[PDB]
Amino acid sequence: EAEAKSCKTPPDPVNGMVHVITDIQVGSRITYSCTTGHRLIGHSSAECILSGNTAHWSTKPPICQRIP
């Protein structure tokens, strides 16, 4: 709970890319994106939360289903 930042940045989703809103500090809320036409199979968002001794993003690795 000091100096902030403790969540490891998520890997770039397939045919997509993650965007940081301001910083990687705990309490923030970044967002995810994908190629035009692909709906985010998740929450389209994240929240840096500590699960004990390791801080990570509450959202699972987003996917792109590709929509006709």
- Give the residue from 3, 20, 14, 68 showing the smallest Cα distance to 42: 14
Is 57 in contact with 7 (CB distance < 8 Å)? yes
Q: Which residues have CB under 8 Å from 7's CB, separation 6+?
A: 24, 26, 48, 49, 55, 56, 57
d(CA 31, CA 44): 6
Dihedral sign for Cα atoms in the order 35, 38, 41, 43: positive
Is 62 in contact with 14 (CB distance < 8 Å)? no
Tell whether domain 6-68 is in CATH 2.60.120.10. Answer: no
d(CA 62, CA 46): 10
- Give the residue from 28, 2, 16 showing the smallest Cα distance to 61: 16
Mapped onto helix, strand or coil, the DSSP state of residue 57 is strand
What does the domain layout of the chain look like in residue ranges?
6-68
